[PDB]
DNA sequence: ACCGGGCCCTGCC
DNA sequence: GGCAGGGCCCGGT
């Protein structure tokens, strides 16, 4: 894909995430945020809030923020990769129809890349060095070694793919899930020689047939319909209604008289 | 235990945990905080952020929460369960000293319980109804029956505590963990006669042999530990100069003279 | 309400 | 610097 294939594609796939974003705020979608309830008078004073009302909108910021990186990883996965570079994604409806990709050791797998010289990729995308521990790496491992010892002709190869940070900022995950077990005995088995693990700049750069600059394009892409969604001042009414929307389902039964919150309450909600 | 030995254990233990999350920021340890470069653009205008160093604050308090919740889900593990109510940690030297626990299935169990009656339970415990996703469900359950099948003599049966929330809130992982697989299939193993899931209230009840109360208490000591901490003054400026220090690791290479970012040298930095 | 996925660190070696 | 683990949601249906 070129430079204008890129961007402008991007740019659809963001313009439509960043409306899904606000729909979160406009629609008051709360339903899906955890507390911790033993850990709410630590949050209170170590970030010095004053009051329940500046509690919820830590709270809040916080739950957004995971929902950003959540939506974030989705969006390259199922929208970008495919509408922008041709990836065949294994959903619901692909996995039914191509031979043998119903079988759950395809759980793991994200897309099919077909290169114009034959050759067929397998890809497992990660967002970063992070997204990984050692539970879900051993199960990589189990799942990758399946498919190359039971399905040898589905592909040429398997690629581990992680979009931003680099090669060596990499923990031993990336390690794990190749069958490099260098501490502890994990029975993972080795199998390095199909699956090869890119990152950052050169994760991007495999992605698109060697162009060096694809990132940009991808960073573009999102800038542009960042700009153009124009949601900087009308976000801050929007963020502030979702905050009382949020307190307003503890505020009438976990305050006391002087407004210091009843943590025992709040534990007693959560926890039955 | 009773009342007054979980206040005053627990309290002892979230001390300890408190002067390591304040070590953070004193010691300035910021090399394990991702950043998103694509991202970047979305969260400025989202959030109403104004420069680079907004950016950068915004990051840090999400690193910080994220490292609590992190923190916190391993003081309950290694240092709660084991001080408070007397759990085995299967951590390396337990593990090497006492067969059969030195075999992978086993990376999975936290603790063995000790009931005074005989009884003898393994528990593999998390924090929420999120704390899990598929790619854990199903390794959690390879584990679990594989230590049912070929190790049936080292416990009466196993148990998933989850510290906070309710059985009706906790997502379908939990189901899939003990082989129930109503949705597509992923080949896990009916296990439920010999796993089963306990949550909140009823998690620590079920720790403390059936004292209801539990959760109040463990809470409590928390709190104490909290208002004998005294940091709510001093963390303003300990979380400033934080940013300060993060601020500092990109500024020359990517500010502009009004304080804003190029957004293009942040992911050339982070990218390579 | 389901559900198949998506995602980011610490504390001690 | 390694490493055995620790943690929290979306979007389609
Ligand atoms: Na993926
Ligand atoms: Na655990």
Redesign the pocket.
Known sequence: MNKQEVILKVQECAA??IL??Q??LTKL?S??????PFMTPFIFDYHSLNDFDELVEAIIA???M??????????????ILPRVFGAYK????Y?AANEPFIH?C?????HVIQRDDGRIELL??????????????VQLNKAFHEIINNYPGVADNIVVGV??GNSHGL???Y??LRGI??????NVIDIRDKVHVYAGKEFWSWLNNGEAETQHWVLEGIERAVKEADIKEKNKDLIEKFKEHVAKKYNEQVLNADGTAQWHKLLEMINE
């Open positions: 439509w995430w899904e974003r729909s979160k979608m339903e899906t945020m955890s507390i911790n916080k739950h957004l995971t929902g950003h990186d959540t939506g974030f990883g989705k969006l390259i996965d199922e929208k294994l959903d619901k409806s996995r759950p395809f759980d793991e797998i994200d497992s995308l990660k967002a970063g060095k992070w997204t990984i521990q050692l539970t879900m790496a979009f931003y923990t031993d995950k390690r794990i077990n260098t501490g502890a005995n994990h």
